[PDB]
């Protein structure tokens, strides 16, 4: 009986492989061959943000494209004014071990998560004029790896317990749990429409999740090692993943397969973060070799490089209006590029 | 060029900078320790004088030590180990009494020692339950020489307790010495289930670690 189920599982995987192979007729590289290259992309560091006295793990741009929050090993959450370099708030954290931060789209909340296995939500705008913990979300048996607000009252998280969750912040309990991953879930990206999201895990697979149904619609597997980073194309019909296999791969939701891989023999370091430009033509990836590479997403030719960090780039963020790119690093500085 | 409200915001940012600098100065005093015992090691019990991630603080010679144990995570620790790449030292606890899992302890120690993130961090190895090891080897009902060929013929560098203890110590010390980099050192200590002085030995090894870092920064060694 067990062998029958194993055989069914194997044959269904083989059928899926054959179907995806049938859908493939021409490659994205072949189709984009007769298109003009982007050319050399030269970006300089317009601003450098100082005040974190330890390693930086996470950054997230606010929706106004001017405020950003960063999390560091020093145990502080700091909100920056990117235009003037001013510090708006400095939030002391109960646990110094942080691995992700998030900024609510409204701007009234930020979220922080780490090895304490709790996603903490902070009320930025409140009478008495100080930041306070509005809600501590307990229920995960592993470290919080990523969190992203959907609304003021909804946040989705990934964790080291190989599971993602959807929370109702006011109630404080999980309303949906997403259970298909074998390894720890490292990264998470919401779709622009918010109905769906993607996550990459240590099993070297990416999964597409229905926020309402609570099911895994699709699974993608091209990477040889763990996926540290994941980003959704601005269209919402594609996403890119980053791994310590040192490749970056682009996957399509509708075609259900990889479209291109962004690799070079010169680069052997792992990808810590990935992000897209507003058009999606540029795919920026942070690496463990202390540099970030600019990739031509449509031709998979490396257009440029951002090289200003003394230590590894932890986090990447392209601002909503597309003007600037933020990069946090283990050297304890965030740099804004343009 | 700068408005009144922008000037006030700049003053606020300067006050925040001052508070951050004061907090960092306060934090720099403490020395940070990572505790990693696989199982049945007495790692919660080794430092008993002072009492998702657990923390304990103890002070010896007016020096603050903060020790981290991560019980929340699953058995494999690979991903979150990059966080503790700045600690003064790691404290590895091993139960020398259990011979069957002793090779598992060796594999765990080798994995921690050869980690890319922890290349520059020393390890203070505590071999726990030496009294249980002594009782077992003195009884002689179970012998490591039977399972392990190496103890059957071993020259020491009771006497049977000595041979067993130095062989077990050499098992870890060989792994530590195999790299030969010299940037980080293993400090092995044989400890019983109850020991009055363990924080003293941690303090001495941390002092030596800081001394070696000083000698390396000064170009002397």
């Amino acid at each position: 009986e067990l062998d029958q189920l194993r055989q069914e599982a194997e044959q269904l995987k083989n059928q899926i492989r054959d179907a995806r192979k049938a859908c493939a007729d021409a490659t994205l590289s072949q189709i984009t061959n007769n298109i003009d290259p982007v050319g050399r992309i030269q970006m300089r560091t317009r601003r450098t943000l100082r005040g974190h006295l330890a390693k930086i793990y996470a950054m997230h741009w606010g929706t106004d494209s001017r405020l950003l929050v960063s999390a560091s090993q020093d145990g502080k959450l700091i909100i920056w004014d990117s235009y003037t370099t001013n510090k708006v708030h400095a939030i002391p954290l109960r646990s110094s071990w942080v691995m992700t931060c998030a900024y609510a789209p409204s701007g009234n909340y930020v979220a922080c998560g780490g090895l304490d296995n709790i996603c903490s939500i902070y009320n930025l705008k409140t009478r008495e004029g100080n930041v306070r913990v509005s809600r501590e979300l307990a229920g995960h048996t592993g470290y919080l790896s990523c969190c992203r607000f959907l609304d003021d009252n909804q946040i989705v998280t990934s964790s080291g317990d190989t599971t993602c969750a959807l929370w109702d912040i006011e109630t404080g309990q999980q309303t949906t749990t997403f259970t298909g991953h074998t390894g720890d879930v490292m990264s998470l990206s919401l779709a622009p429409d918010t109905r769906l999201f993607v996550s990459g895990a240590c099993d070297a697979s990416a999964k597409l999740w229905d926020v309402r149904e609570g099911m895994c619609r699709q699974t993608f597997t091209g990477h040889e090692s763990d996926i540290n980073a994941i980003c959704f194309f601005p269209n919402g019909n594609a996403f890119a993943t980053g791994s310590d296999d040192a490749t970056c791969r682009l996957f399509d939701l509708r075609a259900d397969q990889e479209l291109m891989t962004y690799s070079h023999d010169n680069i052997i370091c792992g990808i810590t973060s990935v992000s897209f430009s507003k058009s999606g033509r540029l795919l920026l990836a942070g690496y463990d070799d202390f540099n970030c590479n600019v990739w031509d997403a449509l031709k998979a030719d490396r257009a440029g490089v951002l090289a200003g960090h003394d230590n590894r780039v932890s986090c990447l963020g392209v601002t909503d209006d597309g003007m600037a790119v933020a990069t946090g690093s283990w050297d304890s500085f965030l740099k804004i590029w343009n | 060029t700068v408005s009144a409200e922008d000037k006030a915001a700049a003053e606020r940012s300067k006050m925040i900078d001052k508070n951050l600098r004061e907090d960092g100065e306060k934090a720099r005093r403490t020395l940070r320790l990572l505790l990693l015992g696989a199982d049945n090691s007495g790692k919660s019990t080794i430092v008993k004088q002072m009492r998702g991630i657990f923390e304990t603080k103890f002070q010896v010679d007016k020096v603050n030590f903060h020790m981290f144990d991560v019980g929340g995570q699953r058995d494999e620790r690979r991903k979150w180990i990059q966080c503790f790449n700045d600690v003064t030292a790691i404290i590895f606890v091993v139960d020398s009494s259990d011979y069957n899992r002793l090779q598992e302890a060796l594999n765990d120690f080798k994995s921690i020692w050869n980690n890319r993130w922890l290349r520059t961090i020393s390890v203070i190895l505590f071999l726990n339950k030496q009294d249980l090891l002594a009782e077992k080897v003195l009884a002689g009902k179970s012998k490591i020489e039977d399972y392990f060929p190496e103890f059957a013929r071993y020259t020491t560098p009771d006497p049977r307790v000595t041979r067993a203890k130095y062989f077990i110590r050499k098992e870890f010390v060989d792994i530590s010495t195999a790299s030969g980099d010299g940037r980080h050192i293993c400090y092995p200590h044989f400890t019983c289930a109850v020991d009055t002085e363990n924080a003293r030995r941690i303090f001495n090894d941390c002092k030596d670690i800081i001394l070696q870092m000083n000698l390396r920064e000064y170009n002397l060694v």
Partner: single-chain antibody, 228 residues
Framework: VQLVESGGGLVQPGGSRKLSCSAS????????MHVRQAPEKGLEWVAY????????YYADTVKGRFTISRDDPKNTLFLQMTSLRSEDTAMYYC??????????????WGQGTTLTVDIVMTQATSSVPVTPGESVSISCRSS???????????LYWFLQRPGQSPQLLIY???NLASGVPDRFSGSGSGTAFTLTISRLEAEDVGVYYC?????????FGAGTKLEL
């Protein structure tokens, strides 16, 4: 959140008196503090003390005679006055303010204490006839442009209902203050600002003041009153 002012009363001319404003229910250290109203006049800004006391400004009228201070552990704010003149008589108000990106200065005011002993901001109408349920527009004008290169126009609106201290409605010409209904709306251009109240109700009656925070000294309009 609460500010209570103590000290005041009759003082002979040339005397000295100290006012005290005690803060309760908010992080007093993080807020910068500031205002007086003569017995039948509009608002006049007196002094400012920054958070941490790094900055102090005074009105030129009171400079050399008024000293402003704060006791952060006790959360108290004070104003030591000397050489008191008959023109000093007023009701002195204690006002909290905080300055970061997106903040709302002058949001809370105290009840005030009564003592008895430059950009020109223009409010043409001293009074405006109004009936309930009808939209009304109140205008203010500035000698120079309150528009700044950063893109902010530092204009504020306050409402002082009868028998009450002022209350912030609009900050930076367009941003509605917290706890204020959507009826109030602020629109304007550089040097020309209007406050439109739509679907007017009772308890909207009072004196509407326009204030600029572009540069110190902070200056007020004369104030336009709404009377049913």
């Amino acid at each position: 959140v609460q500010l209570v002012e103590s000290g005041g009363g009759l003082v002979q001319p040339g005397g000295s008196r100290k006012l005290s404003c005690s803060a309760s229910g908010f992080a007093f250290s993080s807020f910068g503090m500031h205002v007086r109203q003569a017995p039948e006049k509009g608002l006049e800004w007196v002094a400012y003390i920054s958070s941490g006391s790094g900055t102090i400004y005074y009105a030129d009228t009171v400079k050399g005679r008024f000293t402003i201070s704060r006791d952060d552990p006790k959360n108290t704010l004070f104003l030591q006055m000397t050489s008191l003149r008959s023109e000093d008589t007023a009701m002195y108000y204690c006002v909290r303010s905080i300055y970061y990106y997106g903040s709302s200065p002058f949001d809370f005011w105290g009840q005030g204490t009564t003592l008895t002993v430059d950009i020109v901001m223009t409010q043409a109408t001293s009074s405006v006839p109004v009936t309930p349920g009808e939209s009304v527009s109140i205008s203010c004008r500035s000698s120079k442009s309150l528009l700044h290169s950063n893109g902010n126009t530092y204009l504020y609106w306050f409402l002082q209902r009868p028998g009450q201290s002022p209350q912030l409605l609009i900050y930076r010409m367009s941003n509605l203050a917290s706890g204020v209904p959507d009826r109030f709306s602020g629109s304007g251009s550089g040097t020309a600002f209007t406050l439109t109240i739509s679907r007017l109700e009772a308890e909207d009656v009072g004196v509407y003041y326009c204030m600029q925070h572009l540069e110190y000294p902070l200056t007020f309009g004369a104030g336009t009153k709404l009377e049913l």
